[PDB]
Amino acid sequence: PRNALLLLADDGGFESGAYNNSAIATPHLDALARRSLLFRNAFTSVSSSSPSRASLLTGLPQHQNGMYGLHQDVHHFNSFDKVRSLPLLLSQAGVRTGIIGKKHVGPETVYPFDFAYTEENGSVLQVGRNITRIKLLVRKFLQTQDDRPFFLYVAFHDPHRCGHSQPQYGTFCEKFGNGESGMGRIPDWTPQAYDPLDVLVPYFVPNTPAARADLAAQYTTVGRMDQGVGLVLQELRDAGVLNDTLVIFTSDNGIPFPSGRTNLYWPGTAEPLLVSSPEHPKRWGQVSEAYVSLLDLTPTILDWFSIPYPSYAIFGSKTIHLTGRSLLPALEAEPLWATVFGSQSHHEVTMSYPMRSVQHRHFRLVHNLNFKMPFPIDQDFYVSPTFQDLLNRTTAGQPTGWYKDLRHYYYRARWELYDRSRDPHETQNLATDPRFAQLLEMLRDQLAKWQWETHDPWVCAPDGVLEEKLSPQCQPLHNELRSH
Amino acid sequence: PRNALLLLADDGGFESGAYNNSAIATPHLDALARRSLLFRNAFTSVSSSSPSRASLLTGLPQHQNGMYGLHQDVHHFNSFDKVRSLPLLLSQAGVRTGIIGKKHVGPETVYPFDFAYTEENGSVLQVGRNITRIKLLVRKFLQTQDDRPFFLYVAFHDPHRCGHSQPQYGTFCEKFGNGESGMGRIPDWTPQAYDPLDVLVPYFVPNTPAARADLAAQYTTVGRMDQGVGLVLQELRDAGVLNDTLVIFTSDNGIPFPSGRTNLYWPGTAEPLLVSSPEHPKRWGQVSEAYVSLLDLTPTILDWFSIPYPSYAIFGSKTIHLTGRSLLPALEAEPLWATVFGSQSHHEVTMSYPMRSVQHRHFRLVHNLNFKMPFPIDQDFYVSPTFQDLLNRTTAGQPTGWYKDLRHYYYRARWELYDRSRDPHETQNLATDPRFAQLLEMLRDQLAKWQWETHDPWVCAPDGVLEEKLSPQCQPLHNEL
Ligand SMILES: *[C@@H]1O[C@H](CO)[C@@H](O[C@@H]2O[C@H](CO)[C@@H](O)[C@H](O)[C@H]2NC(C)=O)[C@H](O)[C@H]1NC(C)=O
Ligand SMILES: *[C@@H]1O[C@H](CO)[C@@H](O[C@@H]2O[C@H](CO)[C@@H](O)[C@H](O)[C@H]2NC(C)=O)[C@H](O)[C@H]1NC(C)=O
Ligand SMILES: *[C@@H]1O[C@H](CO)[C@@H](O[C@@H]2O[C@H](CO)[C@@H](O)[C@H](O)[C@H]2NC(C)=O)[C@H](O)[C@H]1NC(C)=O
Ligand SMILES: *[C@@H]1O[C@H](CO)[C@@H](O[C@@H]2O[C@H](CO)[C@@H](O)[C@H](O)[C@H]2NC(C)=O)[C@H](O)[C@H]1NC(C)=O
Ligand SMILES: *[C@@H]1O[C@H](CO)[C@@H](O[C@@H]2O[C@H](CO)[C@@H](O)[C@H](O)[C@H]2NC(C)=O)[C@H](O)[C@H]1NC(C)=O
Ligand SMILES: *[C@@H]1O[C@H](CO)[C@@H](O)[C@H](O)[C@H]1NC(C)=O
Ligand SMILES: *[C@@H]1O[C@H](CO)[C@@H](O)[C@H](O)[C@H]1NC(C)=O
Ligand SMILES: [Ca+2]
Ligand SMILES: [Ca+2]
Ligand SMILES: [Cl-]
């Protein structure tokens, strides 16, 4: 019987030897990468936890599945009842499903799991960061197997920040379980300290002491996550099912720094992705240049279990189809896929800054629907040392060491067009350059077509109103905003 | 045994003889007004259907109960599970609950009804506009009563527009059931035609042929709603329970015209309100000047049944308390209440234009949190003849006959302060006038206090971020605001 394992890092980036970061040690991820096809050009469709996890587990963009923003307490976003998620479809096909760690999506009927240990019935600290607890839960899952195939979803909470919720464990909870007084112990974890002067400062992160300290703490926590991956894989090896299991590792969104999480800039949507098939080792240890999306995961896993996507509608007769594709074929031969999309509406319920993006190879186009208002900052990131430092220096009128300034971070153009082959930092907007008018129109057309195809309620915003029963379906408001 | 009846109009305004409109005939509402206390200064806290209905049925502002916007299909907003609504509390106290018409709120567990005929299990056209069907459902409700008190919620869908959904019935569905071909027949309804030249054109509605036609159609439909009220009251009278029943009539938000629905301007939140207590007829046929809110209805009805609001929390240990008050005391003697609040976030999910308001007597202060972006227009109103006409004339550069222009309707000041005793049209913003700096700060303080008191997640927006463990709790973003 075929099995599947989805390892999901929380706010994880490219901090690994597998992705050529020699400043950090991630031997277990590196080991996995040698048995995997590594993707250099993978992206999430949305840079917000719940929406990203909902899209990943449905194959549908947030504006289609209904997770327009964060799921918990006051934010309270849920996917539509009639949505058919991966786990649901797997269960109906006779596959045993399990989740360990951060779920952060609902409702339960849409995202059901036979075996569940999450924040809903326990501590996300334990089942998300305590890799020993995680390892034992994986062991229990495998011991209680019953001849059915399985799908195991391990959603680490590492390397997510902790500064807002639990500061006593460090900015990235890098102190939790380290053995020191009040921290407790995680027997299977060997803490890895990092010097702030040795960490790699990403181009979009301010080069300041405060930021480097943040990164050092992050590195330590990523190491814990790395060791967690090692333990999990070892449990399958001990149960004798690893060689029958498709393993996938990735992250839900960009790292929690400026221009990262919550942005549709490269840093906010670019994600690590490893795919290891025991049946297709031809391209083990290789790197793929194909442009892929987390919207491809549901299709990939369905393909793995030979389960077809059913024909159904959420509203009316509007039949639902996936825009992603199975990545399995890439495990045999390199494809030429070059296009990926992005869609984000809310993060927190108070943060309404819808963005839509399309990327064709190195060209990225972002549409900021509420561009005239300032880009909103979430409550957790606001208190990060990195942002506090940036805010402090900006307010004092002193050099920030940042590749942008807050003014331009807050107030953006409606359309942002970048060529990352020339301008990887995405600082040279080409949208108003007449030499790129034809390319702009092409990308706009591709984006709009995808929006209609995926029933985006925001498809006419902000210059127009959606009127389905007439033509054109987007009717103009004449609100001093251009239309297309 | 005491009963209560809540009659709720959808997008209803002051089109009635009771409110001194001589151009329309509303004999049944006028009759009700003679047996009730009429409120000249009643307001909804939010000018959007689901949020308004959730707030009305909970006593909590939309930003607290969780209905941030519309409830249906793609908009998909629901109140928090732990919210304790009026109907829930009544049920737990042994009161039989019933709803007939448009519900437009959820989830069911939060808003449960023993007897329910709504859009969720039938046609909103029938149970919302077909007053004969409504009358028979009321009859059925009363015939199946036991020795329990009852609370009956009749949510008319009239006089809501129909232009977007069902244009064949007219702009306001004023043709539905009129007898003509394809319209069907409503035996208990006597259609009332109106000349577009005779209707009263509200100050905030463009004086154009297209708008007057809209109003004429509205008047006809309001008449149907009026006759529906008559039938309902008559059913209680036939069951011999009217004299044991507290009757309340009002509307969920302002009329569907410019500056009305979806706005926190006077036209968008001002609502008609009649309260008839068979035990306190002292002030029957009188007019009250007290400033009241639909947030007062839940407290009022709870008071009527002698049911206390329980002590509980939705999140954490932050206990929930109502900011509204029972209106019952006003039925005996005129009070001095002068303050009312407003809070609106979304309408449609794609319409994010949060507004917060406070009104002290004739002074109204509105805060537009997303002011730099244009005011969004909903899909239903966009295709209205009134707006289409306005848009058309504006685009052609011709006179609109409107007291505003679209540019200023779309792009508003962050703070709008109006004195309606001098400027009822609300066109002279005083917020930037130094003469009103002290008053401005006072109203801002009242507004903010209410926001914190009601756990508003938008309390720091847009210039700051909420950090509860820090001081001040609103931390600055320095985002040019
Ligand atoms: C890490 O760096 C190595 C060495 O520079 C990269 O391997 C090279 O990849 C490119 C092909 O696009 C060429 O420089 C050579 O064909 C490769 N050289 C070797 C020695 O393998 C590799 O691509 C990088 N790894 C990742 C994940 O980006
Ligand atoms: C991580 O989880 C492990 C196992 O779930 C915890 O170790 C257990 O701790 C309990 C009480 O704290 C002991 O009674 C058990 O004997 C331990 N079991 C094992 C297998 O070690 C550990 O406390 C957790 N670490 C932290 C920092 O919370
Ligand atoms: C692990 O899985 C692989 C793939 O299924 C097994 O290798 C296959 O073995 C079969 C015979 O049983 C051959 O016909 C195939 O050609 C093999 N495929 C590949 C890709 O090598 C392997 O035997 C399994 N067991 C171990 C210990 O690796
Ligand atoms: C309908 O119109 C009448 C007459 O204008 C209003 O009654 C007047 O109210 C004002 C202000 O309260 C008093 O100063 C006058 O003495 C009243 N005149 C009369 C003849 O009664 C009445 O308030 C209006 N009704 C409504 C509901 O607005
Ligand atoms: C209608 O209801 C009122 C009030 O419930 C009745 O009048 C009350 O009668 C009770 C006892 O019969 C007295 O204690 C109250 O003082 C009365 N209230 C008032 C305001 O008069 C009245 O009898 C009822 N009418 C009918 C026909 O039954
Ligand atoms: C920012 O400034 C505040 C107040 O001046 C200070 O207390 C804090 O330490 C500073 N934080 C950072 C990260 O620089
Ligand atoms: C607005 O203009 C369009 C196109 O000229 C026209 O067809 C339509 O009838 C106009 N709408 C109104 C309400 O006059
Ligand atoms: Ca995340
Ligand atoms: Ca309404
Ligand atoms: Cl909830």
DSSP B52-105: HHHHHTTSS-HHHHS--S--STTT-----TT---HHHHHHHTT-EEEEEE----
DSSP label of B250: E
At B7, which helix (H) or strand (E)? strand B3-9
Classify residue A432 as exposed, middle or buried by CB count within 10 Å of its CB (0-12, 13-18, 19+).
exposed
- Alpha carbon separation from B410 to A330, A478, A479, B5, B53 (Å, rounded): 50, 9, 6, 39, 26
Q: Rounded to an integer, what distance in angstroms lies between the CA atom of residue A362 and that of residue A369? A: 23
Ligand nearest to the CA of A157: 8
Q: Is B399 close to ligand 5, i.e. is its CB under 6 Å away?
A: no
- Alpha carbon separation from A152 to A91, A138, A157, B150 (Å, rounded): 12, 8, 16, 52
Q: Is A177 close to ligand 2, i.e. is its CB under 6 Å away?
A: yes
Task: Decide the pairing of beta strands B415-419 and B3-9.
Answer: unpaired
Provide the number of structural domains found in chain A: 1
Report long-range pairs for B357-363 (Cβ below 8 Å, ≥24 apart): B357/B264, B357/B269, B357/B447, B358/B443, B358/B446, B358/B447, B358/B450, B359/B43, B359/B291, B360/B443, B360/B446, B361/B291, B361/B421, B362/B419, B362/B420, B362/B421, B363/B417, B363/B418, B363/B419, B363/B420, B363/B439, B363/B443
Ligand nearest to the CA of A44: 8
Q: Whose CA is nearest to atom 2 of ligand 4?
A: B20
Identified catalytic residue from A84, A261, A356, A412: A261
Residue B77's closest CA among B271, B270, B342, B352? B352
Residue A383's closest CA among A128, A161, A169, A201? A161
Q: Rounded to an integer, what distance in angstroms lies between the CA atom of residue A81 and that of residue A400? A: 46
Q: Rounded to an integer, what distance in angstroms lies between the CA atom of residue A153 and that of residue A10? A: 13
Instruction: Examine residue B479 and state whether it is found in any structural domain, yes or no.
Output: no
Q: Is B243 close to ligand 5, i.e. is its CB under 6 Å away?
A: yes
Chain A residues within an 8 Å CB radius of B345:
349
Cβ contacts below 8 Å, chain A against chain B, sum to 101
Asked whether B8 and B246 are in contact (CB, 8 A), the reply is no
> What is the torsional sign of CA A408, A409, A413, A415?
positive
Rg (CA), chain A: 22
Task: Decide the pairing of beta strands B37-43 and B287-293.
Answer: parallel
Q: Rounded to an integer, what distance in angstroms lies between the CA atom of residue B294 and that of residue B289? A: 15
Report long-range pairs for B387-392 (Cβ below 8 Å, ≥24 apart): B387/B258, B388/B210, B389/B206, B389/B208, B389/B210, B389/B211, B390/B206, B390/B208, B390/B258, B391/A477, B391/A478
Sheet holding B415-419: strands in order across? Answer: B339-346, B352-360, B363-368, B415-419
Classify residue A461 as exposed, middle or buried by CB count within 10 Å of its CB (0-12, 13-18, 19+).
buried
At B116, which helix (H) or strand (E)? strand B115-118
Task: Decide the pairing of beta strands A245-251 and A3-9.
Answer: parallel
**B171 is written with which tokens?**
């702009």
Ligand 2, closest atom to CA A185? 27
Residue A76's closest CA among A112, A109, A104, A117? A104
Q: Rounded to an integer, what distance in angstroms lies between the CA atom of residue A116 and that of residue B145? A: 46
Classify residue A115 as exposed, middle or buried by CB count within 10 Å of its CB (0-12, 13-18, 19+).
middle
Q: Rounded to an integer, what distance in angstroms lies between the CA atom of residue A271 and that of residue B244? A: 67
Using DSSP, how many helices (H) and how many strands (E) does chain B show? Answer: 13, 15
DSSP label of B2: -
- Alpha carbon separation from A250 to A23, A299, A419, B148 (Å, rounded): 20, 15, 25, 60
Nearest residue of chain B to residue A469 (CA atoms) = B164
| Angle B167-B170-B172 from CA coordinates, rounded to 5° | 105
Task: Decide the pairing of beta strands A352-360 and A115-118.
Answer: unpaired
Which region holds residue B321: left if phi is over 0, alpha if psi is between -120 and 50, else beta? beta
Classify residue B351 as exposed, middle or buried by CB count within 10 Å of its CB (0-12, 13-18, 19+).
buried
A478 close to B (CB below 8 A): yes
3-state secondary structure chain A: CCEEEEEEECCCCCCCHHHCCCCCCCHHHHHHHHCCEEEEEEECCCCCHHHHHHHHCCCCCHHHHCCCCCCCCCCCCCCCCCCCCHHHHHHHCCCEEEEEECCCCCCCCCCCCCEEEECCCCCHHHHHHCHHHHHHHHHHHHHCCCCCCEEEEEECCCCCCCCCCCHHHCCCCCCCCECCCCCCECCCCCCCCCCCCCCCCCCCCCCCHHHHHHHHHHHHHHHHHHHHHHHHHHHHHHCCCHHHEEEEEEECCCCCCCCCCCCCCHHHHEECEEEECCCCHHHCCCEEEEEEEHHHHHHHHHHHCCCCCCCCECCCCCECCCCCCCCHHHHCCCCCCCEEEEEEEECCCCCEEEEEEEEECCEEEEEECCCCCCCCCCHHHHCCHHHHHHHHHHHCCCCCCCCCCHHHHHCCCCEEEEECCCCCCCCCCCCCCHHHHHHHHHHHHHHHHHHHHCCCCCCCCCCEEECCCCCCCEEECCCCCCCC
Q: Rounded to an integer, what distance in angstroms lies between the CA atom of residue A223 and that of residue A221? A: 5
Q: Rounded to an integer, what distance in angstroms lies between the CA atom of residue A38 and that of residue A29? A: 11
Q: Rounded to an integer, what distance in angstroms lies between the CA atom of residue B225 and that of residue B13? A: 12
DSSP label of B313: B
> What is the torsional sign of CA B428, B411, B257, B72?
negative
* Other Cβ atoms closer than 10 A to A133: 21
Classify residue B91 as exposed, middle or buried by CB count within 10 Å of its CB (0-12, 13-18, 19+).
middle
DSSP SS3 for B153: strand
Containing structural domain, residue B49: 1-459
Instruction: Examine residue B309 and state whether it is found in any structural domain, yes or no.
Output: yes
Residue A93's closest CA among A148, A154, A152? A148
Residue A322's closest CA among A307, A338, A334, A336? A307
* Other Cβ atoms closer than 10 A to A143: 9
Instruction: Examine residue A471 and state whether it is found in any structural domain, yes or no.
Output: no
Torsion on CA atoms A466, A472, A475, A476, rounded to nearest 10? 140
Q: Judge: A462–B373 Cβ closer than 8 Å, yes or no.
A: yes
Chain B residues within an 8 Å CB radius of A73:
315
Q: Is B40 close to ligand 4, i.e. is its CB under 6 Å away?
A: yes
Half-sphere exposure of residue B30: CA atoms within 13 angstroms, side-chain side: 12
Asked whether B262 and B31 are in contact (CB, 8 A), the reply is no
| Angle B261-B72-A452 from CA coordinates, rounded to 5° | 100
Resolution, angstroms, 1 dp: 2.4
Task: Decide the pairing of beta strands A273-276 and A37-43.
Answer: antiparallel
Please state at what angle helix A209-238 crosses helix A131-143, rounded to 10 degrees.
20
Q: Rounded to an integer, what distance in angstroms lies between the CA atom of residue B391 and that of residue B147? A: 57
Q: Judge: A410–B457 Cβ closer than 8 Å, yes or no.
A: no
Chain A residues within an 8 Å CB radius of B68:
349
Asked whether A332 and A288 are in contact (CB, 8 A), the reply is no
Q: Whose CA is nearest to atom 25 of ligand 3?
A: A243
Picking from B64, B72, B74 by the largest number of A CB atoms within 10 A of its own CB, the best residue to mutate is B74
Residues 6+ apart with CB under 8 A from A321: A309
Asked whether B67 and B77 are in contact (CB, 8 A), the reply is yes
Amino acid at B40: R
B467–chain A nearest CA distance, Å: 7
Q: Is B287 close to ligand 4, i.e. is its CB under 6 Å away?
A: yes
DSSP label of B152: E
Q: Rounded to an integer, what distance in angstroms lies between the CA atom of residue B154 and that of residue B133? A: 12
Ligand nearest to the CA of B41: 4
Residues 6+ apart with CB under 8 A from A286: A37, A38
Q: Rounded to an integer, what distance in angstroms lies between the CA atom of residue B130 and that of residue B236? A: 18
**B3 is written with which tokens?**
């009963």
**A23 is written with which tokens?**
């400043």
**Closest residue to B457, CB basis, from A315, A349, A477:** A349
Task: Decide the pairing of beta strands A245-251 and A415-419.
Answer: unpaired
Q: Rounded to an integer, what distance in angstroms lies between the CA atom of residue A181 and that of residue A184? A: 7
Amino acid at B413: A
Residue B343's closest CA among B51, B92, B147? B51
Pocket of ligand 6 (CB under 6 A): A 210, 385, 388-389, 392
Residue A43: strand pairing partners: A270, A293
- For chain B, the residue count is 481
Instruction: Examine residue B121 and state whether it is found in any structural domain, yes or no.
Output: yes
Q: Rounded to an integer, what distance in angstroms lies between the CA atom of residue B373 and that of residue A412? A: 13
Q: Judge: B74–A315 Cβ closer than 8 Å, yes or no.
A: yes
Nearest residue of chain A to residue B167 (CA atoms) = A469
Give the determination technique. Answer: X-ray
Nearest residue of chain B to residue A82 (CA atoms) = B73
Ligand nearest to the CA of A106: 10
A243 close to B (CB below 8 A): no
Q: Judge: B479–A374 Cβ closer than 8 Å, yes or no.
A: yes
For chain A, the straight-line distance linking the first and the last C-alpha, in angstroms and rounded, comes to 51
Q: Output the CA A2–ligand 3 centroid distance in Å.
A: 13
B162 close to A (CB below 8 A): no
**Closest residue to B382, CB basis, from A374, A376, A467:** A467
Chain A residues within an 8 Å CB radius of B343:
none
Q: Is A132 close to ligand 2, i.e. is its CB under 6 Å away?
A: yes
> What is the torsional sign of CA A216, A222, A228, A233?
negative
Candidate of A383, A392, A402 to mutate for ligand 6, largest count of ligand atoms within 8 Å of Cβ: A392
- The verdict on whether A135 is a catalytic residue reads no
Asked whether B275 and B37 are in contact (CB, 8 A), the reply is yes
Q: Rounded to an integer, what distance in angstroms lies between the CA atom of residue A443 and that of residue A440? A: 5
Ligand nearest to the CA of B107: 10
**Closest residue to B382, CB basis, from A76, A379, A465:** A465
- Which of 319-378 (B) contact A at CB < 8 A? 345, 348-350, 352, 370, 372-378
Instruction: Examine residue B478 and state whether it is found in any structural domain, yes or no.
Output: no
A376–chain B nearest CA distance, Å: 8
* Other Cβ atoms closer than 10 A to B3: 25
- For chain A, the residue count is 484
Q: Rounded to an integer, what distance in angstroms lies between the CA atom of residue A414 and that of residue A428? A: 14
Ligand 7, closest atom to CA B388? 13
Instruction: Examine residue B238 and state whether it is found in any structural domain, yes or no.
Output: yes
Asked whether A276 and A248 are in contact (CB, 8 A), the reply is yes
Buried b (16+ CB within 10 A) or exposed e, A221-259: bbbbbbbbbbbbbbbbeeeebbeebbbbbbbbbbbbbbb
Q: Whose CA is nearest to atom 20 of ligand 5?
A: B279
Q: Is B442 close to ligand 4, i.e. is its CB under 6 Å away?
A: no
- Alpha carbon separation from A81 to A67, A313, A410 (Å, rounded): 11, 11, 35
- Alpha carbon separation from B63 to B139, B356, B443, B453, B474 (Å, rounded): 37, 10, 19, 11, 17
Q: Rounded to an integer, what distance in angstroms lies between the CA atom of residue B57 and that of residue B245? A: 18
- Name the residue with tokens 């939060």: B110
Half-sphere exposure of residue A266: CA atoms within 13 angstroms, side-chain side: 23
A462 close to B (CB below 8 A): yes
**B4 is written with which tokens?**
């209560």
Which region holds residue A455: left if phi is over 0, alpha if psi is between -120 and 50, else beta? left
- Name the residue with tokens 């209205």: B384
**B201 is written with which tokens?**
């054109």
> What is the torsional sign of CA B41, B42, B48, B51?
positive
Q: Output the CA A65–ligand 10 centroid distance in Å.
A: 19
Nearest residue of chain A to residue B77 (CA atoms) = A77
A480 close to B (CB below 8 A): yes
**Closest residue to A76, CB basis, from B80, B475, B477:** B80
Task: Decide the pairing of beta strands A96-101 and A150-155.
Answer: parallel
* Other Cβ atoms closer than 10 A to A16: 25
- Which of 383-402 (B) contact A at CB < 8 A? 383, 391, 394-395
> What is the torsional sign of CA B213, B219, B221, B222?
positive
- Alpha carbon separation from B432 to A304, A448, B428, B436, B439 (Å, rounded): 64, 42, 11, 8, 12
Residue spans of alpha helices (H) in B374-428: 379-382, 385-395, 406-410
A379 close to B (CB below 8 A): yes
What CATH number did the domain enclosing B190 receive? Answer: 3.40.720.10
Residue A101: strand pairing partners: A118, A155
For chain B, the straight-line distance linking the first and the last C-alpha, in angstroms and rounded, comes to 56
Q: Output the CA A40–ligand 1 centroid distance in Å.
A: 11
Instruction: Examine residue A349 and state whether it is found in any structural domain, yes or no.
Output: yes
Instruction: Examine residue A397 and state whether it is found in any structural domain, yes or no.
Output: yes
Ranges of beta strands (E only) in B301-373 are 339-346, 352-360, 363-368
Report long-range pairs for B468-476 (Cβ below 8 Å, ≥24 apart): B470/A383, B475/A382
A482 close to B (CB below 8 A): no
A313 close to B (CB below 8 A): no
Asked whether A130 and A101 are in contact (CB, 8 A), the reply is no
Q: Rounded to an integer, what distance in angstroms lies between the CA atom of residue A407 and that of residue B68? A: 30
* Other Cβ atoms closer than 10 A to A81: 11
